Design a binder for this molecule. Structure first.
Ligand SMILES: [Cl-]
Ligand SMILES: [Cl-]
Ligand SMILES: [Cl-]
Ligand SMILES: [Cl-]
Ligand SMILES: [Cl-]
Ligand SMILES: [Cl-]
Ligand SMILES: [Cl-]
Ligand SMILES: [Cl-]
Ligand SMILES: [Cl-]
Ligand SMILES: [Cl-]
Ligand SMILES: [Cl-]
Ligand SMILES: [Cl-]
Ligand SMILES: [Cl-]
Ligand SMILES: [Cl-]
Ligand SMILES: [Cl-]
Ligand SMILES: [Cl-]
Ligand SMILES: [Cl-]
Ligand SMILES: [Cl-]
Ligand SMILES: [Cl-]
Ligand SMILES: [Cl-]
Ligand SMILES: [Cl-]
Ligand SMILES: [Cl-]
Ligand SMILES: [Cl-]
Ligand SMILES: [Cl-]
Lengths: 16, 16, 16, 16, 16, 16, 16, 16, 16, 16, 16, 16, 16, 16, 16, 16, 16, 16, 16, 16, 16, 16, 16, 16
């Protein structure tokens, strides 16, 4: 799956 | 180059 | 914000 | 998984 | 139609 | 900002 | 409109 | 050839 | 999953 | 809507 | 910021 | 629908 | 110049 | 095949 | 030419 | 023609 | 933010 | 699943 | 780099 | 047919 | 302007 | 390679 | 006109 | 790399 990253702090990566 | 991330485990970052 | 990645080496993650 | 949205009314969110 | 979401508050879903 | 949704369960929406 | 096909079962064709 | 779909109703699948 | 069609005759649809 | 032209004969213009 | 336009009538211009 | 602007004079906004 | 087509009916071909 | 138009006058359409 | 809008306040549109 | 690959096992490539 | 440049002379860059 | 290809040498085909 | 496949015979893989 | 160009040196123009 | 090539033989390039 | 500009300050131009 | 940038070194900005 | 052509004169081919 592709991996998408967000900066919220904390960085979280979500799978696609 | 653009960096594209995948998750398979292990992360793989591939480039453009 | 979403993190967009480039590689030039240095990896750069910029926030959208 | 990422949720992709369409509208046809019914709203449909499909998972990638 | 494709449904595109925005956040301004309030959520706004606009279509294609 | 644009809104991106993921199904993880729980649905979470992240801003861009 | 463009027609986009998905498989979930059942086929779902959504439009643009 | 790949089949590309439109809807106008009539459904049209054209070959690429 | 997304559905992709090909004309080979016989029409075959492959999942993504 | 965007208009997309094809040639098969006859011309077919399909829309988005 | 860039202005992105939709029409749903109301015209909506959202800022990026 | 997405709204696309052109300048020719006069402005013309066309949609998707 | 390239001709880009929309339909709104009136067909509009704009030059790029 | 897809049809691409150009304004050169005279309008000419080329197949893809 | 295409028209691109920015919010700077004042809204300014630039031609492409 | 472009070549598209699928993993079904067996890998099959379809022409476009 | 992304940076977009225009030639108007004077070159001006607008943020996105 | 569809196979997406990169080259970094090693050729990598990842499944969608 | 992204790898793009074509079929002409012989296969040709070209890169981005 | 449209000619698509790559460079790998050799320049390659492939027909669509 | 961008340059687009077609194979018709004779190769012809059209400006955009 | 394509050059993409960002503003953070300082300008950063990253490539494809 | 919009300025599109490449790098080949020389930086080239072309006008659209 | 993809090769992109422009016309200014002189032809300039730039790459991705
Ligand atoms: Cl945000
Ligand atoms: Cl280095
Ligand atoms: Cl993005
Ligand atoms: Cl997942
Ligand atoms: Cl209804
Ligand atoms: Cl997606
Ligand atoms: Cl074929
Ligand atoms: Cl009908
Ligand atoms: Cl296609
Ligand atoms: Cl801004
Ligand atoms: Cl109304
Ligand atoms: Cl944008
Ligand atoms: Cl021209
Ligand atoms: Cl009407
Ligand atoms: Cl165009
Ligand atoms: Cl699958
Ligand atoms: Cl190596
Ligand atoms: Cl894909
Ligand atoms: Cl042809
Ligand atoms: Cl060489
Ligand atoms: Cl093409
Ligand atoms: Cl202009
Ligand atoms: Cl050099
Ligand atoms: Cl552009």
């Amino acid at each position: 799956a592709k991996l998408v990253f967000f900066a919220e702090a904390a960085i979280i990566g979500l799978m696609v």
